[PDB]
Write a protein that binds this ligand. Structure first.
Ligand SMILES: [Mg+2]
Lengths: 90, 241
């Protein structure tokens, strides 16, 4: 319906373990929506809060915003690294 | 430049493997076709680097050898070959005859190193090429040989309109989806999320549910190409009559 960029994405651990199969995703996807897709793939009773990184740069507002600061090879499947958010002291 | 010998030798090795398949395809198409007009067929090769990532390079060359020679054996008409990716290249014109030397030339010029897969740009350009040849003389057929992945970088709305514009121009399009069984993920396993509502769980559909081409075949093994593609061409022939 829109002419925003879409591309293939693959979720994986910090340790490199892939999660699910690749996903076609609009480039303006938010970390909040990435969390919802990740909750589906993990299928846990209570989903952990997650942070998302592409090439060691965190996705804060949108995937497209983070990619604007990188020289990415668009033909390849983009790997997205997820990690649980920190728990702070006391 | 003289090292066209390398390309010619490579094409000859493809002809050795694909010769029986091309005859089976010719015969099966002949049986279907009897059941004065002239045919114009364009073969489009995806020259983007994802073909190397998805290991669909061999399937692409094998398919071109099978299809291009079967159409030549069948004496259907004029064959054009195009490559697309970052730009559109006409590798073989309609009015020139398609021979083994033509196949060697396509082999040398397709290195699958292009950094984009602009399928919408390709479709918008071929309409001018088809329309110019319709008036030079007919049923027109476009066969897209591609991995069918990463097709939405230009925007989904633009890609869908480009497919619709080819149909409105009376061009019949069949997408030949190359799917190597050795690859980690099949194109049937790629998924797409659909969101609705704040914080609500998204619906997980298959990526092929939004494939912008309604007429397609899935090719895992070139040995299945004669039986699968000839069955698919039934729809084109019936629409022409
Ligand atoms: Mg590609």
């Amino acid at each position: 319906a829109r002419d925003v960029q879409r591309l293939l994405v693959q979720f994986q651990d910090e340790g490199g373990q892939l999660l699910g199969s690749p996903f076609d995703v609009p480039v303006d996807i938010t970390p909040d929506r990435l969390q919802l897709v990740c909750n589906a793939l993990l299928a846990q009773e209570d989903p952990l809060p997650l942070a998302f990184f592409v090439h060691d740069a965190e996705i804060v507002s949108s995937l497209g915003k983070t990619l604007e600061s990188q020289a990415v090879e668009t033909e390849k499947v983009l790997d997205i690294i997820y990690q649980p958010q920190a728990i702070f002291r006391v | 430049p003289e090292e066209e010998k390398v390309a010619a030798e490579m094409w000859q090795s493809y002809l050795i493997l694909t010769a029986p398949l091309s005859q089976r395809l010719c015969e099966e198409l002949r049986l279907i076709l009897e059941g004065k007009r002239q045919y114009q067929i364009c073969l489009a090769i995806d020259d983007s680097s994802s073909m190397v990532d998805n290991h669909t390079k061999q399937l692409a060359f094998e398919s071109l050898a099978v299809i291009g020679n079967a159409l030549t054996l069948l004496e259907v008409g004029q064959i054009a070959v195009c490559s697309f990716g970052e730009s559109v290249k006409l590798l073989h014109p309609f009015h020139e005859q398609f021979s083994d030397y033509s196949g060697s030339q396509i082999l040398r010029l397709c290195k699958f190193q292009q950094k984009k897969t602009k399928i919408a740009q390709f479709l918008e350009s071929v309409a001018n090429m088809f329309a110019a040849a319709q008036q030079l003389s007919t049923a027109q057929l476009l066969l897209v040989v591609s991995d069918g992945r990463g097709l939405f970088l230009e925007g989904k709305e633009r890609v869908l309109a480009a497919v619709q514009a080819a149909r409105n121009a009376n061009i019949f399009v069949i997408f030949v989806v190359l799917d190597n069984p050795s690859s980690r993920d099949s194109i049937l396993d790629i998924k797409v999320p659909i969101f609705k509502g704040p914080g609500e769980m998204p619906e997980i559909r298959s990526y092929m549910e939004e494939f912008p081409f309604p007429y397609y075949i899935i090719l895992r093994d070139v040995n299945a190409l004669p039986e699968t593609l000839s069955d698919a061409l039934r729809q084109w022939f019936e629409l022409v009559t």
